[PDB]
Symmetry: D2
Subunit: 116 residues, 4 copies
């Protein structure tokens, strides 16, 4: 899996299910071009975003709609979304797992990068 | 001081000093307009970004240049920046403290929102 | 898996491999009785700590030797260990995943609790 | 003030006020001796726990009573407490700020260590 995103709920102690996100790749003119998208499964995971051959060097942005997640639970959260912006594949292919841990007024994110 | 940002270094156990950041505000055409910028002090804090009169309702983005911070220490980090995007002052004026805790492959951010 | 522990390295962007931990259960006299132990795999995970029938209500402590992990990388960390203390199984069996994200001067921990 | 503790609430976006904590110091027989205790103020801070003369080299544990904090808000949290165990002052006197960011099923802790 070249790119996987895992989202956890720090309030309820559960995967964060049905969390929507879009992935963009920065174009030569500094605009954000659409690249991938999806929503998390019952395990809190989103797999299948891209393929190795399509996922080349670039600056990528994962924009996670955390606000909709909290609003569906009746909570007015702080953030509009959680963003993760990173250069990928600049030393050739790697496998990336982006994890996000969500609370209404806070998020934490980490990456695991593995060489195939 | 209705907006303050504090940045901590989870590797060295210190404030994150001389970290640059830029603040943007979403315009009516949905573009990001420059709003303020600055660098953290020896305490890891950036004060004086705005004023009560200038800090109107809106969607704001703080982009913290974590990449330059790590690179100056000889570390090639994961993220291009740490981002915080939030609606401010929509129920009247509030004071916001944004805190960020930085590691090379992870960051955590929280907000403290107070009604004066 | 009644109890699994997953450990991640926020500095290197990797699983934290070969991290040792012991699990204790609080006895009636408030002392900590040995309960389980192991070290993380190449995936950063420790499975097989207990079985459903052995893992009953109690206060459990997972004591993770983070200091040895950092010292092996030539780093003098802040914490002696990372501890996670929690009541488990007070409403009957659950499955617990404890995750820890490590930096030299910081750790973050979360739990995912699932009803079988 | 060589030891200060600051506690933040990631759910409400506020300092964590009136949070109790106890500090222990490891004795020569490896038992935990009571060292100091207190409660956080309206700013989420606990100052005045110790003095330069009293805060000798040793292994210290801060146990923050997060369980009572969440229960008072009607939340049944995961952890019994948030724990920070560390060696202090082994290379001479330092000033320590321990920060903790709390959610019902997660906590994050960091240290800022300064040489006066
Ligand atoms: C005065 O020392 C301070 C002041 C302050 O406003 C915040 C913090 C810590 C914030 C923080 C963020 C994220 C984390 O994961 C863990 C702590 C420490
Ligand atoms: C439960 O299974 C998993 C799989 C995984 O890849 C990561 C995590 C936790 C990530 C995480 C992020 C931020 C934090 O502050 C603390 C943990 C948990
Ligand atoms: Na390259
Ligand atoms: Na309004
Ligand atoms: Na019960
Ligand atoms: Na010494």
């Amino acid at each position: 899996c070249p790119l996987m995103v895992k989202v956890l709920d720090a309030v309820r102690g559960s995967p964060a299910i049905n969390v929507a996100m879009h992935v963009f790749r920065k174009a030569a003119d500094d605009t954000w071009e659409p690249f991938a998208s999806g929503k998390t499964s019952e395990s809190g995971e989103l797999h299948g975003l891209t393929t190795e051959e399509e996922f080349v060097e670039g600056i990528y942005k994962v924009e996670i709609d955390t606000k909709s997640y909290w609003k569906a639970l009746g909570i007015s959260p702080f953030h509009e979304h959680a963003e993760v912006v990173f250069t990928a594949n600049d030393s050739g292919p790697r496998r990336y797992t982006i994890a996000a841990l969500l609370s209404p007024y806070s998020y934490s994110t980490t990456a695991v990068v593995t060489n195939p």
